[PDB]
């Protein structure tokens, strides 16, 4: 006779929203755009390099935040290495909860439920930090009940959107009732820099990182008939890579958020990642009994750190070339989200199944995997089910 | 049959360690030793304003990692608006894992399991932040198994003791077998600075704050006579306070962290506590069957932000004048901690129960209260439940 009470089933998105900046800056003009921006078309070789990234990023385009005209009133975002936190902070302390507003209240008018049944939210971002945080400054735009149990998850990176769905998962299968606003707002004001030739790793960050905030509704035990799952939480694991130590450092410095990158990355990823999902799948489907499904009868939301990442785990693990469809789309139209980014791709592949008619939530696939890598080498990985559909 | 099993009984507290630097800064000194090591003895009517602070702060000493010998050595620290948040962090990212691997050390050997069956680590610091974090540089401190799932919970102030106690519960009480490391790691080299008379409510900081780690085991189904419980997590609340906009505010700036106090805070909480205890306990104890227990019968595990805080609560809740001690024994040797705090008080309570021999692990009460305040204004409230001893 628990003092609190629990719930019976798996936790499950009720909802998604998604919001972007409207600032779109097409890819093909970003090379032009970013260099001569940071006074830096002089640098012929650098940006060279910086075009041959764009050119292989597989990103067409991103919504960014900074316009030209915010960069030209903020000379100091222009250079390389000046100081310019307290400006970020001012910023994206601002403008993190409010994209992520937006977000959430597409979400929550999706679900259909009036906003004081929201007795949980999961703030994430990797773009600033503040006391009260991102996530009551959300609750204060929302008017979100006064004793919503709040939980803000700073300076996560990449891996971040896996994070929140292992949290997720339990503050709604051990709360009866409990419905889970969990909000993910990346805006990059945090890490822009101009270019330089020592520090070409951060190279990378600007051909890739865009902005975005995206926002579920997770609960157990939905009501029939009146709210509807889209996916199910039923295995979460995180693991350190191994030989990965430094491989992606980020550090929020007077200078902002500098960004540390190692080029084996994918290789570390794509080697390692067989192993894990092979452990997940048995540890969720054990012989004692269906064998784990085939990686290509599974549907995918991977986080789509680089087309490197992609392309190399696809050919380590043998997948079908329209396994990663869903998260492709989403890197081309988005760039690099950060924790977001996973959620938009939950909501492309949702969106799509409906759209042509597929079986289920997850491309007419049953089960599926969503993976979130970052800073650690950490490495999220969520076994989700689909939800038959009509 | 679910893909993870859940656990059955409460989420228990099965260990407590923790750990302080070794410099102690004898209150009655400090005055003499603030002015001195910042220059500012000219002060005269700064300082004797601060003298009367610590005076009746209550606090007798702290234990501090900055040092006469590290001031010195680093004179922006002992300035009131340098830049030095670079310095700082280089500081607080390794010395705030660094001391929260002595508590966990400790905790860990008196729970008795080997570290590997840690499943879940759960790190809360004020002081900080870097990715990887805080939990990933404790992990690799300790060793714990590469897929332990890490949790940071960053810039959370001094509501985090209660905030951790929330979370670590359902990570306990959703996952069979789940064991919880929680850490609380707190380092004023972040926010220390030099005085100012335009900056009274920091001047507050000063003569309050105290570095120091605590850490927990929790887990749910303890194994009988292997195992110990000192405390179970029964019930979970969150509120911001009416009218406390601004009340506590935090800011990440180039000159490090900030610190903003409203001097109505005591009142702020003072007045509201009563209605959100009464709604607690009448959660906890239904009607439809027991009453309440009176205040005066619960144990109080009260995050003492200030003595002003402590004494309006003791007078509007009409607290006999004993109950409080515990709590104001731990702000006497330590300071606020901010997040540590109520974890100290928490084995204080638990080791005066057993040196004298009470009946149960809280004062020989059955049921009792966590409280930790901290921007917001956050108030969160944890019923817990002793273990009756021998
Ligand atoms: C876009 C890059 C980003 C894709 O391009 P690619 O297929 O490697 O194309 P190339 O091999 O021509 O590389 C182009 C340039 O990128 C540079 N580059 C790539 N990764 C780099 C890194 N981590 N640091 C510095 N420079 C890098 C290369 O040195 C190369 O320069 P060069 O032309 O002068 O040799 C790709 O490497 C990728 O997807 N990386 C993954 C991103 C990642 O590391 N993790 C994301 C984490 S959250
Ligand atoms: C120690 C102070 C800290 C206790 O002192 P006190 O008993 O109120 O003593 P006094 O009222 O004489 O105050 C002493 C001085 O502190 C000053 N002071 C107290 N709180 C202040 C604040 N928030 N900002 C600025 N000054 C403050 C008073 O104005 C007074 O100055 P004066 O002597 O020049 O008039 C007390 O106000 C307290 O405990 N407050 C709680 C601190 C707090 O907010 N903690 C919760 C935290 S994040
Ligand atoms: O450098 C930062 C940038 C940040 C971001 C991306 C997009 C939008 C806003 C912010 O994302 C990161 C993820 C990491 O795993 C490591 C990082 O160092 C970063
Ligand atoms: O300014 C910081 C200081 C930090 C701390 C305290 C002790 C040791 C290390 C760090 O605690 C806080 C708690 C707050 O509720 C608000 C704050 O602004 C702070």
Same mark, same amino acid.
Do not use: H, L
């Given at each position: 006779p628990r003092k609190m009470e629990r719930a019976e089933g798996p936790a499950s998105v009720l909802a998604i929203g998604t919001a972007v900046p409207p600032n779109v800056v097409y890819q093909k003009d970003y090379p032009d755009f970013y260099f001569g921006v940071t006074n830096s078309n002089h640098k012929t070789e650098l940006k060279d390099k910086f075009q041959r990234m764009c050119d292989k990023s597989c990103v067409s385009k991103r919504h960014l935040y900074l316009t030209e005209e915010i960069l030209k009133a903020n000379p100091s975002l222009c250079a390389?290495?000046?100081?310019?936190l307290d400006l970020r902070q001012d910023i994206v302390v601002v403008e993190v909860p409010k994209l992520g507003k937006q977000a959430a209240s597409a979400a929550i008018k999706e679900w259909?439920?009036?906003?004081? &049944?929201?007795?949980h939210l999961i703030f994430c971002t990797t773009s600033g930090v503040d006391m009260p945080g991102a996530d009551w400054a959300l609750a204060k735009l929302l008017g979100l009940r006064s004793s919503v149990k709040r939980l803000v998850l700073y300076m996560?990176?990449?891996?971040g959107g896996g994070t929140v769905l292992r949290i997720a998962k339990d503050l709604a299968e051990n709360n009866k009732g409990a419905r889970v606003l969990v909000v993910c707002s990346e805006i990059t004001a945090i890490t822009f820099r101009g270019p330089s030739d020592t520090h070409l790793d951060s190279l990378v960050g600007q051909a890739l990182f865009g902005d975005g905030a995206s926002a579920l509704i997770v609960g157990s035990?939905?009501?029939?008939?009146?709210e509807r799952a889209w996916f199910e939480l039923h295995w979460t694991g995180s693991d350190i890579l191994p030989n990965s130590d430094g491989a992606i450092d980020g550090h929020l410095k007077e200078v902002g958020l500098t960004f540390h990158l190692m080029k084996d990355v994918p290789a570390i990823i794509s080697k390692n990642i067989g192993g894990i999902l092979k452990d997940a799948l048995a540890k969720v489907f054990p012989a004692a009994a269906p064998p784990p499904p085939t990686y290509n009868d599974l549907f995918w939301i991977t986080h789509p750190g680089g087309p490197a990442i992609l392309d190399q785990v696809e050919d380590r693990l043998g997948l079908? &070339?329209?396994?990663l469809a869903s998260t492709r789309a989403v890197l081309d139209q988005?760039?690099?989200?950060?924790?977001?980014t996973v959620l938009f791709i939950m909501d492309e592949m949702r969106k799509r199944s409906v759209e042509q008619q597929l079986g289920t939530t997850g491309e007419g696939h049953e089960w599926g995997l969503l993976l979130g890598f970052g800073p650690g080498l950490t490495c999220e990985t969520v076994v989700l089910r689909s939800v038959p559909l009509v």
């Open positions: 390389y290495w000046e100081p310019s259909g439920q009036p906003k004081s &049944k929201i007795t996560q990176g990449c891996y035990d939905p009501v029939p008939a009146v079908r &070339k329209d396994k988005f760039g690099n989200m950060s924790s977001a």
